[PDB]
Amino acid sequence: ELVMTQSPAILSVSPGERVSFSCRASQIIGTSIHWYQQRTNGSPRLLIKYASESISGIPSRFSGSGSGTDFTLTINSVESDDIADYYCQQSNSWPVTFGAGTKLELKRADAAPTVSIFPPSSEQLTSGGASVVCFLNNFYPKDINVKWKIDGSERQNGVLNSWTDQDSKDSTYSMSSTLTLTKDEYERHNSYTCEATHKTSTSPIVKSFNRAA
Amino acid sequence: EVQLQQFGAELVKPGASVKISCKASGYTFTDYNMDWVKQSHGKSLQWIGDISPYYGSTGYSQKFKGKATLTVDRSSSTAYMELRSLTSEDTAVYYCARRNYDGSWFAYWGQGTLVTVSSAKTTAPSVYPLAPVCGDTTGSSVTLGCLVKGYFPEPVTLTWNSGSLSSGVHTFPAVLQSDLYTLSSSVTVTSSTWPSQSITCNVAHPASSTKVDKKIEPR
């Protein structure tokens, strides 16, 4: 099948900017590429057909170009409502295939995460479980890594992560990570650490506690 | 106006099958194939297959051939997709879509049906207070939280101080793991505000008729 690679995977933009992104096919497909927008919680919406052809009801901001293997979607004068995912799709050969998308987000200044760690509540322990929670709040850019360590050893099982969408007020991101053990398991170790790395991190951010301080 | 009507969501058990429908209006059902597309959470669009409503003939991507079976009911202008032997990898949004005249691009889309795979029955959350570890009151702000763990199905509602504390809150999307959902929420306040002033997590889970007010107490 025909592979479509889109780039960049994420593009940080400001309203009013002119921005462009790429869809590259693994073989020549003429002009048989089509572009879709998909807003959060929305269905895909065709913007451009056959590489460059306009679609009724789509603003003139959107324009497509290219032919052969290399295709480009350009948004002249980005607007806030253009913050969305964009996919390309080819119709040269059966089966149709799609690119993996370019995501637009809003640019803002770097912001280091505020990291907080929380030992299991007495209520949960009494019931036989032990969740340790780590919040990493109000950071930018969106990419972040979190490691859990128990007595200095990395632990990957028993972890559940959740990420918020970009905040509509300050354009930051936040993250929750929860490590869940049994009470008995929890009581076999002393140190618990949530360690974060980020663009802003000169040293990894370390939040920890001992059950025996 | 063309319409491809899909239900918002379906819930199915692992190992079972589920049959999703897409009802077409505003055009002649047998003039066009019906296509189907999968989109896993946070991921891209994947073509599943298509069907000719007049002839019943079908085509499938190799990835989904055999996982998906497409049918139609001409008399109800309805296309169906049956997913077989469900696993958690099948939890995703499934769109129907209809191409343009020449079958090149996707002219119309359904809203997509979220298919959730879980063996759970209705289960009340355990709501746990998240208080800071003592000693390091640090300086400036303090962050508290609420952990809403092991419930099913969605949704829950979570507020702080009955909705009066709304700034400095992050309520995180729920995550499904081992058949149950877990959700958390943080709230951040000036450090002189707490624990001198009370902060409470209010959690409701309508499906189980659960309502809990958990005060966050220093530990």
Side-chain angles (χ1 to χ4, degrees):
Chain A
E1 300 174 352
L2 307 193
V3 301
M4 303 300 309
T5 315
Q6 289 188 246
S7 183
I10 291 156
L11 194 62
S12 308
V13 314
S14 305
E17 252 194 288
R18 182 166 172 287
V19 308
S20 68
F21 37 90
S22 154
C23 176
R24 173 160 289 149
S26 57
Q27 57 163 79
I28 293 285
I29 56 173
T31 55
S32 297
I33 201 77
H34 319 280
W35 289 95
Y36 299 88
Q37 174 187 74
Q38 189 184 33
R39 289 186 181 126
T40 304
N41 295 336
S43 291
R45 160 166 87 130
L46 182 78
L47 302 172
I48 295 286
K49 67 172 168 79
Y50 282 107
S52 67
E53 303 183 353
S54 62
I55 297 299
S56 188
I58 295 309
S60 325
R61 304 200 290 293
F62 297 98
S63 82
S65 55
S67 74
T69 57
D70 287 4
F71 301 92
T72 301
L73 188 65
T74 293
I75 309 173
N76 307 276
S77 313
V78 160
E79 293 184 358
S80 64
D81 324 280
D82 307 333
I83 302 307
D85 290 296
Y86 294 84
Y87 306 102
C88 63
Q89 171 250 318
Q90 66 83 23
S91 61
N92 181 267
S93 290
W94 195 94
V96 299
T97 50
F98 293 92
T102 285
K103 183 185 296 304
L104 266 46
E105 60 141 19
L106 291 171
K107 186 103 182 337
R108 57 150 293 137
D110 290 347
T114 296
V115 183
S116 301
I117 193 174
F118 302 87
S121 71
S122 61
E123 330 203 11
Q124 182 183 28
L125 290 168
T126 287
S127 83
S131 294
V132 194
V133 176
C134 187
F135 292 124
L136 308 93
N137 284 347
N138 296 94
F139 57 89
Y140 186 89
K142 67 181 287 151
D143 314 279
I144 191 171
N145 276 336
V146 176
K147 277 194 209 207
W148 285 96
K149 295 183 194 175
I150 304 177
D151 285 335
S153 291
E154 194 177 336
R155 174 64 179 259
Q156 311 206 37
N157 280 25
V159 184
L160 178 157
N161 293 325
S162 187
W163 300 265
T164 56
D165 289 355
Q166 187 166 41
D167 186 89
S168 54
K169 212 169 293 183
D170 70 5
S171 294
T172 65
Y173 294 90
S174 298
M175 190 187 169
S176 181
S177 184
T178 300
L179 173 65
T180 291
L181 307 179
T182 64
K183 171 201 160 176
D184 290 342
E185 202 170 4
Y186 177 70
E187 295 190 338
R188 297 183 185 107
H189 308 101
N190 197 23
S191 289
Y192 289 87
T193 295
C194 172
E195 178 185 271
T197 316
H198 186 248
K199 182 187 172 192
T200 56
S201 307
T202 68
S203 294
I205 302 181
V206 166
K207 286 293 180 160
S208 68
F209 70 85
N210 284 343
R211 290 202 303 114
Chain B
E1 166 181 24
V2 168
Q3 274 180 314
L4 301 167
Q5 192 210 315
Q6 299 186 261
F7 294 138
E10 298 268 17
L11 164 57
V12 298
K13 291 185 174 192
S17 63
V18 63
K19 186 185 284 182
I20 303 310
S21 58
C22 173
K23 188 170 181 104
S25 194
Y27 74 95
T28 302
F29 187 52
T30 59
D31 278 350
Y32 296 85
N33 295 344
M34 192 68 75
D35 285 74
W36 293 83
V37 176
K38 177 181 177 185
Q39 183 172 43
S40 294
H41 189 69
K43 308 281 177 190
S44 56
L45 302 171
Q46 305 178 73
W47 194 65
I48 295 172
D50 57 4
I51 183 158
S52 160
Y54 196 76
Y55 297 77
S57 47
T58 53
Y60 296 96
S61 51
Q62 273 291 114
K63 175 166 181 174
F64 292 95
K65 189 164 196 176
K67 160 70 71 183
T69 298
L70 306 180
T71 57
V72 299
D73 178 352
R74 282 182 291 281
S75 81
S76 68
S77 307
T78 301
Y80 300 94
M81 172 169 75
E82 180 172 37
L83 304 162
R84 294 183 186 285
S85 184
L86 296 143
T87 78
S88 54
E89 285 164 32
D90 295 319
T91 289
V93 171
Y94 292 90
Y95 290 97
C96 57
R98 200 215 79 186
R99 295 197 201 181
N100 71 308
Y101 183 68
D102 83 350
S104 299
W105 37 275
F106 295 92
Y108 296 99
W109 296 77
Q111 72 167 330
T113 297
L114 173 69
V115 172
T116 294
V117 181
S118 169
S119 189
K121 60 187 86 181
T122 295
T123 299
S126 293
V127 182
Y128 299 128
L130 298 181
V133 222
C134 92
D136 262 16
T137 183
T138 187
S140 182
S141 90
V142 61
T143 292
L144 300 188
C146 189
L147 181 63
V148 182
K149 169 168 163 58
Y151 65 93
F152 186 89
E154 291 266 59
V156 295
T157 55
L158 185 153
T159 59
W160 292 93
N161 287 1
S162 303
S164 297
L165 183 55
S166 55
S167 59
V169 173
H170 290 293
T171 296
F172 295 87
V175 179
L176 181 59
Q177 267 198 15
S178 306
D179 298 310
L180 308 173
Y181 291 94
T182 295
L183 175 144
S184 60
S185 181
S186 69
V187 57
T188 299
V189 296
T190 68
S191 180
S192 71
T193 280
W194 179 96
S196 48
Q197 304 178 41
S198 79
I199 292 173
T200 295
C201 186
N202 324 110
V203 177
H205 182 231
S208 60
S209 299
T210 292
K211 286 181 193 298
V212 170
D213 295 315
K214 302 299 297 200
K215 182 177 185 185
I216 313 305
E217 294 264 346
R219 53 159 99 228

